[PDB]
Amino acid sequence: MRECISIHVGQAGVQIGNACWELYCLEHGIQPDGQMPSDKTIGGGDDSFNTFFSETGAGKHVPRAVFVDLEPTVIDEVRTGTYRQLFHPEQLITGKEDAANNYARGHYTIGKEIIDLVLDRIRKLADQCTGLQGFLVFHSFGGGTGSGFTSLLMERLSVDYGKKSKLEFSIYPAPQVSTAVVEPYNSILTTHTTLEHSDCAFMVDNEAIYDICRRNLDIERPTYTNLNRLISQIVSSITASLRFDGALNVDLTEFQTNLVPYPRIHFPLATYAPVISAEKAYHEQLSVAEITNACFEPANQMVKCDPRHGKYMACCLLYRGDVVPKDVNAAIATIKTKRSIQFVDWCPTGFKVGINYQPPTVVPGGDLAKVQRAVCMLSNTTAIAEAWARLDHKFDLMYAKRAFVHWYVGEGMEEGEFSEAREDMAALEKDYEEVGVDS
């Protein structure tokens, strides 16, 4: 057994971590007080759920988790909320003033004053691990803390834990819920500084989740609570292989081996089905063929883009519920004859398949209906570069006039860091085109 430490940075990272740990407790039969009646080994053990949970002598199961924010109001809701007893106070770290939607303020000005404290609290979790695999980092691209603090932390984690895998869950900015005009600046600056330090990053476009909540859950105007419950289902699908018995994606290293043959092209597209309204009083249950076919619909993706117009380097299907390999293999054969699935020439045309028989858990009173089977597809496709192209274009429009740049320079960042970050993204866009497009 090999531990994973989860790190939740800034508002988005913290509120998504709240939703994920709530869901993990329900999946493993852990009560809000930390007690787990089904766990017969009191005070310790090396079960699969111990990757994410440590154990006290009193039978308390404690998330291997640090929550960091530069202002207190979001983490104060964890401190006084339903799961307050789950976390020891030293896991919950807050400053007094936030990074004001400014990468430079998060990374340089406020980062420099809190970074040694955060590494000390992480070191305390690491010291209770017998075989630490590495880190799962949850943050927004758009916020000052999510962008600037995370990139400093990722750099320091490469220094202090050089052999450890780092996986990111990154919220890509959408104007329907965004709070800052400068989010494209913050997104490019953090992607540039983080890119060498991350082994595998799962981007979630708030626009895709927003539209899935409107279209499939009939929510007129989705809140963060709606978006986060859906995001937590997809995160849980991805991490289930680390928390349950199985033979696929069983360690963080296996995410890179299975999904990322080229180190810089480390952004797999997640697609999730089915998403069904709990309020829907009559629902016909979807077959293995229907949920698998829905993995090739752009409307079900975590990022809107068109995989028909790129190439695959890797594809994993992660099934939960009543699924046997025979039905998966028949589903795939039918899909191959009907869809545009083109792999690069240097990769086998193939699917790694994981099945966990426990159906998806839902949060009581939530928006998601209980279903008999669900699937998350993780595919490394060049089509995800569309999302970089969109962000780079918005960056270029503002930067050509130096709009808002004085806020970043005023924090002690050099103007040169903008053009260096942007050149790294130009080289990334070009890497995706070389792997993806024919001539």
Binding site: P175, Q176, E207, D211, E297, P298, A299, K304, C305, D306, R308, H309, K338, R339, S340, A385, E386, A389, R390, H393
Partner: protein, 342 residues
């Protein structure tokens, strides 16, 4: 007020669609780099499809299908026909074609070129790209080196009388956002004004029926018809008088079959049915007719122009079926569809 941007200044079809949209008073042209448009009349090359359909509160439509280039580049069309089960290597309405680089198909092309030598069959070919005609292999291959396709040349074309002269047929086809395939009822014959000469391929004015080549080199430009353009009413009269058939029966059944076969083949790859933005595109299909009244596809154009007198009607057709269908204000087409059971 619906909004649109114009990103291709050199398109005569979309300059006219642009003028028609403005004259309804219900459409406002924005600056080309304003993102808040309903409609993009897009550039020909590197259209940023990846930036479409991410504007909240705007339904966005573009006048190009991403991936349609598979049909509309010479090399791609040859590959698509051989390798698609539904078109197949044994496809009967496309000339025997091979892709040739200066992957490659040289030694497969030479193998088939020998079967004609061997059996005393007519052995003339045409090299072309995105032009030379010879019965000698090694002169075609030398020219290429000096990305191309070598395509069997149609040695027995149908010839219009008077003038013993070659022609090709241009058909205009509109594919709407729902993937309805609309064939414009007016086509055009681009005629030669020179008699056809099977013993002299060196002289290319009586062999190549393009509107630019006949306008410069041919010394009979306009002798038989205005431009080198015969329209369907006259060509149909010609086929009734001379050959005792119709344009519908002898040619148009085959044209409709071919258009429907090409576009139904790429539909899973280009359809925008379940996508965050929507597409339409105007195609130009170019056909040859042989002396048995068998129809051959030569090429598909992704950005065609129109015959001068058909601009008005076709462009109004594009606003009616492509644009107003998606953005309604306050038929000249045949809908190609066939649901045979088997």
């Amino acid at each position: 007020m619906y909004t649109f941007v114009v990103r291709d200044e050199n398109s005569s079809v979309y300059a006219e669609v642009s003028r028609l949209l403005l004259a309804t008073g219900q459409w406002k042209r924005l600056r080309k780099d304003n993102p808040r448009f309903n409609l993009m009349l897009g550039e020909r090359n590197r259209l940023p499809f990846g930036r479409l359909g991410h504007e909240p509160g705007l339904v966005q439509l573009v006048n190009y299908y991403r991936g349609a280039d598979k049909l509309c580049r010479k090399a791609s069309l040859v590959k698509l026909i051989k390798t698609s089960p539904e078109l197949s290597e044994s496809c009967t309405w496309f000339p025997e074609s091979y892709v040739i680089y200066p992957t490659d198909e040289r030694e497969v092309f030479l193998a088939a070129y020998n079967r004609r030598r061997e059996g005393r069959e007519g052995n003339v070919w045409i090299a072309k790209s995105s032009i030379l005609i010879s019965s000698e292999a090694s002169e075609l291959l030398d020219f290429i080196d000096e990305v191309h396709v070598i395509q069997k040349y149609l040695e027995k074309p149908l010839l219009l009388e008077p003038g013993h002269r070659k022609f090709d047929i241009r058909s205009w086809v509109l594919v709407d956002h729902l993937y309805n395939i609309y064939l414009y009822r007016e086509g055009v014959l681009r005629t030669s004004s020179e008699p056809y000469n099977s013993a002299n391929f060196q002289d290319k004015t009586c062999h190549l029926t393009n509107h630019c080549i006949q306008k410069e080199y041919s010394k009979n430009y306009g002798r038989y018809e205005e431009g080198n353009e015969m329209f369907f009413e006259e060509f149909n009269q010609y086929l009734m008088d001379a050959l005792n058939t119709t344009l519908e029966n002898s040619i148009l059944l085959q044209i409709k079959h071919i258009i429907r076969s090409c576009l139904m083949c790429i539909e899973p790859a280009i359809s925008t049915k379940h996508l965050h933005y929507q597409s339409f595109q105007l195609f130009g299909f170019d056909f040859m007719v042989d002396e048995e009244l068998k129809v051959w596809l030569i090429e598909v154009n992704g950005a065609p122009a129109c015959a001068q007198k058909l601009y008005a009607e076709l462009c109004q057709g594009i606003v009616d079926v492509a644009i107003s269908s998606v953005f309604p204000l306050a038929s000249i087409f045949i809908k190609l569809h066939h649901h045979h059971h088997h």
